[PDB]
Each structure stands twice: as C-alpha cells, then as structure tokens.
C-alpha cells in the first residue's frame, strides 16, 4: 500500500474547519496564517476562487476517504510574481502553485513526493498548464527540495518587503523528463 491521491475543488462550507486547523499548525508557518480566524481563512479561499478563469482555485486531496492536503493553482498575473521588476516573464498557460499539507503527523513513506506528483499532473493535464511557476521564501528549504524532486529549475531570487523569494519554473517537458511522465521523482 502506497499513496495514490484524488482531488476535488474546495468547498468552503465544509472544508473551512479543516483548512483553518491546518494553517494553525507550526509546520504550516510559511503560509503566514498561524493566528488567522475562520473568517480570514474563508476570505483566503474565496479570493483564491475569484479569478474569471475556472482553471484556478484551491483543491483538496484525498486518500482512503480522508483529506490529505490543499493545493492552489493560481493566476500568476494577479500574484506577487507579476509585481513590476520581479524578473518573472509570463507565458500563456503559466499556472502558479501553493501546497498546504494537513496537520496530521502520521505518514507512510514518500508522502510529499506523491503529493507533488499528483499536483503537478493535475496542473499540466487537467488544468492545461504549460508551465508551473512558484516563488517560495528562499529560506523554505523543504519546498526547494520538493520542487527539485519534480523538475523545477531555479530562475533567480527577487526581493519582496522583508523577504527574498526564489522564482522557479517547471515546464511540462521538464516534468515529463524528470519524473517519467509523473510516475517517480527525479
């Protein structure tokens, strides 16, 4: 028995309690929502679903009937990536991605690799992305490792107020080569 995930679109009326709980767990601190209220998390979810294009929004992943993670596929043009001067070069079909794992601590081997493979296959083959774009905090080493595991390449670092973001790209072609079409890690 290994991880195989499915996902669906978020449903704020019934996922809010879970998502808010996950955002309060110290391991989630890079989401910067540790002290958020339910209303704050409701706004986060609703804002993530407000693009005109239905491909964007938050999704919830499942295994054995239980919630496992949240992911956001977002429009790079309404994100910090598109601030003037970041160095991001937008391409049609770019999709930004964020991942939030659940607050559960008991995992089978290779949890986050299976999570990442599922997310990336969803972005490319269900949401039509030609490239996934991310810009985590440079200090978030765990995310750097996850990115490298599925073929992301670092493009550069750029400043945001008080922080440094590390811009990375994963083209559909680099994902396919690195992971054998989404089957295994680089």
Query: ∠81-121-164 over CA atoms, to 5°?
Result: 25
Give the helix/strand (H/E) hosting 177.
helix 172-179
94 vs 122: CA distance, rounded Å: 13
Ordered strands of the 131-134 beta sheet: 6-9, 57-63, 66-74, 94-101, 131-134, 163-171, 153-160
Minimal CA–CA distance to 15: which of 58, 74, 65?
A: 58
- DSSP state, residue 137: B
Residue 148 resides in a domain: yes
Cβ neighbours of residue 3 closer than 8 Å, sequence gap 6 or more: 63, 108, 110, 111, 114, 115
Give the dihedral of Cα atoms 163, 33, 96, 65; nearest 10 deg: 150
Residues of the domain holding 168: 6-179
Question: Judging by beta carbons within 10 Å of its beta carbon (0-12, 13-18, 19+), is residue 16 exposed, middle or buried?
Answer: middle
Residue 148: CATH number of its domain = 3.40.630.30
The DSSP result for 9-52, as a single string, is E--HHHHHHHHHHHHTSGGGGGGS-TT--HHHHHHHHHHHT-SS
Residue 186 resides in a domain: no
Residue 127 resides in a domain: yes
Residue 185 resides in a domain: no
* Dihedral sign of CA atoms 82, 57, 178, 103 in order: positive
Residue 101 resides in a domain: yes
Q: Which CA distances in Å does 101 have to 106, 119, 175? A: 12, 12, 21
Query: How was this model experimentally determined?
Result: X-ray
Residue 77 resides in a domain: yes
Contact 56, 95 (CB under 8 A): yes
Q: What is the largest CA-CA distance in the chain?
A: 47
Q: What is the resolution of this structure in A?
A: 1.4
For 89, the token pair is 């070069």
Question: Judging by beta carbons within 10 Å of its beta carbon (0-12, 13-18, 19+), is residue 118 exposed, middle or buried?
Answer: buried
Minimal CA–CA distance to 98: which of 145, 132, 148, 63?
A: 132
Q: How many domains does the chain have?
A: 1
* Dihedral sign of CA atoms 54, 3, 170, 165 in order: positive
For 158, the token pair is 């750029």
Residue 1 resides in a domain: no
Residue 165 resides in a domain: yes
39 vs 170: CA distance, rounded Å: 33
């Amino acid at each position: 028995t290994t991880y195989h995930f499915q996902s669906r679109r978020i449903d704020v009326d019934r996922d809010l309690e879970s998502v808010h709980r996950w955002l309060g767990h110290p391991k989630s601190h890079y989401w910067d929502m540790l002290n958020s209220s339910l209303a704050d998390v409701e706004k986060l979810i609703r804002d993530a679903g407000a693009d005109p294009d239905p491909r964007f929004g938050m999704r919830i992943g499942y295994f054995e009937g239980e919630r496992q993670f949240l992911f956001e596929l977002y429009n790079p043009l309404t994100s910090d990536l598109a601030r003037p001067g970041t160095g991001y070069v937008y391409e049609t079909g770019d999709i930004g991605m964020h991942l939030l794992v659940s607050s559960s601590e008991r995992r089978l081997p290779g949890f986050t690799g299976a999570v990442m493979l599922h997310i990336m296959r969803t972005a490319f083959f269900e949401a039509g992305a030609r490239r996934v774009v991310v810009a985590p905090d440079v200090r978030n080493a765990d995310v750097q490792r996850l990115n490298a595991a599925v073929g992301f390449r670092v493009a550069g670092d750029f400043p945001v107020p008080g922080k440094t973001a590390r811009l990375s790209y994963c083209t559909r072609e680099d994902f396919a080569r690195a992971t054998d079409n989404g089957r295994t890690l680089a």
